[PDB]
Amino acid sequence: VVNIARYLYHGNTNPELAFESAKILCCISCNSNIQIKLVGDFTHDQSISQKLMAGFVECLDCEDAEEFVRLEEGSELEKKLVAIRHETRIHILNLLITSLECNPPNLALYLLGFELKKPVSTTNLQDPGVLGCPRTCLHAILNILEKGTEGRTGPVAVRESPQLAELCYQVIYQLCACSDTSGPTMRYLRTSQDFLFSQLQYLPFSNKEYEISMLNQMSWLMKTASIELRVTSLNRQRSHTQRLLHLLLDDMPVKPYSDGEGGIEDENRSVSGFLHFDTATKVRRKILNILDSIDFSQEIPEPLQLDFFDRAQIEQVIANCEHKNLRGQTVCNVKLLHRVLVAEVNALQGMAAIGQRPLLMEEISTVLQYVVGRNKLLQCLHAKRHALESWRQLVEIILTACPQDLIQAEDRQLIIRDILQDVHDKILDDEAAQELMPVVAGAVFTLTAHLSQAVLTEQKETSVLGPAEAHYAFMLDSCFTSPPPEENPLVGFASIGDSSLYIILKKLLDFILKTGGGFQRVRTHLYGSLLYYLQIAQRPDEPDTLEAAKKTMWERLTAPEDVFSKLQRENIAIIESYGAALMEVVCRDACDGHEIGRMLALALLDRIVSVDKQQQWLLYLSNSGYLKVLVDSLVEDDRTLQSLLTPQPPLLKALYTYESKMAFLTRVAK
């Protein structure tokens, strides 16, 4: 194996020997049992080990691009040699990717430069040549993404080798997600390269050919940026947390360093535009501009039509070929499907079959092309969903792990109010892929919970200013110009009355209606979102003072309405405006839905019957009979609740659903 790996030290002079070497070593690196011994035989002889490290780096830092495989002018032999060198890089990156999820010590931790004569987490990674550090595959994987980071065009490999860039970002994700690489790596990427700032500035990536691969490049870069926001915050590294937040969240156009003495000419662009001076051109935040580049629609290839083969049998022969690839994705094995369909076009002994054989091969060609379309569709629906999951992961760390003194009580609310409205419209459109709905509702839940939590600090830290002392504070800072009118300083609390909050309520009810009854996990997140939204409209607990009890029935009828009593009226009037369709959707899922579906829909009926002042929902619940289904079922709950009185109860779920059923009944009974 060591003499196989020594062919990599000849990668420039015999690329066809370095190719099969890297590929054999990629096949062998799949075996987690063998990894620990390869680290032995590759490091026991340091003179050979320095040639092995050199050969793996020599294949990666080679400059040849994916362009030269497409340019029709080039020699067959040159096109072949560039493709062989590119496969040699891909098999080295696959070898590293498979090796990094094998337990330490593994071959990738050697090739990337970790101190496999210590615990891995104590590795002091450094730049090439520093203290005599060799150049390693880590400094090569960085060089591949570093080329072009000065440029207005962004990184070179994102354009000129997009499959190489996708795999390079995956190795950097594995080096940051595993516990004992993360400490050494998340130091090094900042101390010497600033890498997460110098790459995130170029999001989103854009070419119409490589959409799947760019969504995966962006998926891995959002998944490393995720970990650094959490790591910097937990280590209280405020300036680096804040600098990564600004790069994602500011409504500001990031200007490159604007040194002097260049500009003019481009006066060609269509004079007709000179009257569309569109002030709608808001500087939309970087994290929303990444949600824009995540498409939610999908091309579905047309249903197969056939004159010779039964489609009801071909769909089963396709299913019998839908194996899992090295990314865990289900995809049809086009080479197995072709072998099987050609075997039947050999088994058809007939006068007739041997005249039809051309048309049978021609219909095999349309079946195989449709199955290549099915394989694109499954990989695109993966990439869109993996990117949306990576984006959701980044948003939720900004909310759950970054300090509250890095995003304030109003801008944190505006960011969540805007993100909710953008996340809703891309799933309220009817071309939107249903595979995204479990990620979208799973995001809308965390967003509505954090909107509710932000108002539920704002209410309480505003609840400090006594209206008696401010009159002295205003009496010093004696500036002297033009007076304003008598306007009242009560501003931020008025935002609890936005049209944005009423739009977010509608868009959430619209998505509750649109989510079909099989999407039970989507509906449990959306009923959770509507409970957290209906906590924004919650009056707090007031103290039973012997002085609040003096406020007369006149003061209790001639005070102005508080914003929560207003917001409750306008939110129940919005809920009423969906009527019997929303009433069926909630009452049926309260009777009949999932374990957690019933539990949440009953808590939602408890919250709606806490604001209904017309009894419309009670009159629906009675005349539909659902108020009796939620009562006759107590004699079936009981049999489950008896089992929860055993010393070790199997699942507390049925108690928690009974407690929300009995809460709903104990709301109705008032």
Partner: protein, 52 residues
């Protein structure tokens, strides 16, 4: 774990779902004692004038 994001961004959502149910239930059940107490006190806030 701690570089582990998906265990964390699962568990705090199961926690948040239970918490959204919990204050609905416990605010409605506290509002059961208080409703008997106010009703007891309001029928008594009839009876003492039937007396007087």
């Amino acid at each position: 774990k701690d570089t582990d994001i998906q265990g964390f961004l699962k568990n705090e959502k199961d926690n948040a779902l239970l918490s959204a149910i919990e204050e609905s239930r416990k605010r409605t059940f506290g509002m059961a004692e208080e409703y008997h107490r106010e009703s007891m006190l309001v029928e008594w806030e009839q009876v003492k004038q039937r007396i007087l």
